């Protein structure tokens, strides 16, 4: 194996109940080595897939090319750039900007959004 293997075991909150649609909680079967998820208000139970039920502090979420919705490119008050070549389309006109968050914490790194209809593609530098 390798340390290159990404860290996404499946955080997973919802796959809630199938009958009354309320939230499922883990609970043990000491007899078969199986995790089960049960609704607290009904007799419904089902085995879990991953043995993971909680993680905390990826600390490095890089949220660098996610949540940043492509429609941001229409904003006139953001700086258009003559700096060329979107990395997908053969056209310049990337709109760029810092952080745009409170969880960024100290970033000075630029984020670039191509603005022509052929991409919507986004990328850091």
Partner 1 sequence: NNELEPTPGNTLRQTFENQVNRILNDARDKTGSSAQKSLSEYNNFKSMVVSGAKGSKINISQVIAVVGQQNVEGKRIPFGFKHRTLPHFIKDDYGP
Partner 2 sequence: KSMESVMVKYDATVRNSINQVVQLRYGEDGLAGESVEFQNLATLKPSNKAFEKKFRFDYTNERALRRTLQEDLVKDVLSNAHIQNELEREFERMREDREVLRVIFPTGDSKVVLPCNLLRMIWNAQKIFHINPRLPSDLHPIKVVEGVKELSKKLVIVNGDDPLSRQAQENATLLFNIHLRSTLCSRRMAEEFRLSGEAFDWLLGEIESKFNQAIAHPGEMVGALAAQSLGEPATQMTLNTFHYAGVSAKNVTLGVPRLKELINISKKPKTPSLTVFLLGQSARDAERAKDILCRLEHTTLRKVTANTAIYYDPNPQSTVVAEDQEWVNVYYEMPDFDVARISPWLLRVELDRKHMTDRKLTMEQIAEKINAGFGDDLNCIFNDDNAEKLVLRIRIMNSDENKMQEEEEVVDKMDDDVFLRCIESNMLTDMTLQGIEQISKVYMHLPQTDNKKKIIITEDGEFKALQEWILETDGVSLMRVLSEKDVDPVRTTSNDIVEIFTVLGIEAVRKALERELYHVISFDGSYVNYRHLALLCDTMTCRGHLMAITRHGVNRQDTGPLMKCSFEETVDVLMEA
Tell me the C-alpha distance between 113 and 123, whole Å.
7
Nearer to partner 2 (CB atom), residue 52 or residue 70 = 52
Task: Report the interface residues with partner 1, using CB under 8 A.
Answer: 75, 77-79, 97-98, 100, 105-109, 125
Nearer to partner 1 (CB atom), residue 24 or residue 95 = 95
Which residues, numbered 31-90, are part of the site for partner 2 (CB under 8 A)? 33, 35, 48, 50-59
Enclosing H/E stretch for 114: strand 111-114
**What residues contact 10, with CB distance under 8 A and at least 6 apart?**
49, 50, 52
Contact yes or no for 60/19 (Cβ under 8 A): no
Nearer to partner 1 (CB atom), residue 72 or residue 89 = 72
Q: What are the binding residues for Zn(2+)?
A: 17, 20, 39, 42, 86, 89, 114, 119
Closest CB 113 distance from partner 2, rounded Å: 31
Closest CB 86 distance from partner 2, rounded Å: 35
Nearer to partner 2 (CB atom), residue 27 or residue 84 = 27
Please give the structure tokens belonging to residue 119: 């991409």
Tell me the C-alpha distance between 29 and 39, whole Å.
15
Please give the structure tokens belonging to residue 28: 């043990």
Angle made by CA atoms 95, 99, 102, in degrees to the nearest 5? 145
Site residues for partner 2 per CB under 8 A: 1, 3, 7, 9, 25-28, 30, 33, 35, 48, 50-59
């Amino acid at each position: 194996m390798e340390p290159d293997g990404t860290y996404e075991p499946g955080f997973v909150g919802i796959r809630f109940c199938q009958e009354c649609n309320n939230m499922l909680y883990p609970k043990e079967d000491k007899e078969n080595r199986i995790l089960l998820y049960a609704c607290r208000n009904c007799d419904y139970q089902q085995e879990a897939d991953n043995s993971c039920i909680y993680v905390n502090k990826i600390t490095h979420e890089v949220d660098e090319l996610t949540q940043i919705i492509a429609d941001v490119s229409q904003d006139p008050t953001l700086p258009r750039t003559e700096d060329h070549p979107c990395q997908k389309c053969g056209h310049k006109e990337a709109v760029f900007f810092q952080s745009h968050s409170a969880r960024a914490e100290d970033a000075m790194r630029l984020y670039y959004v191509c603005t022509a209809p052929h991409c919507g593609h986004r990328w850091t530098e």
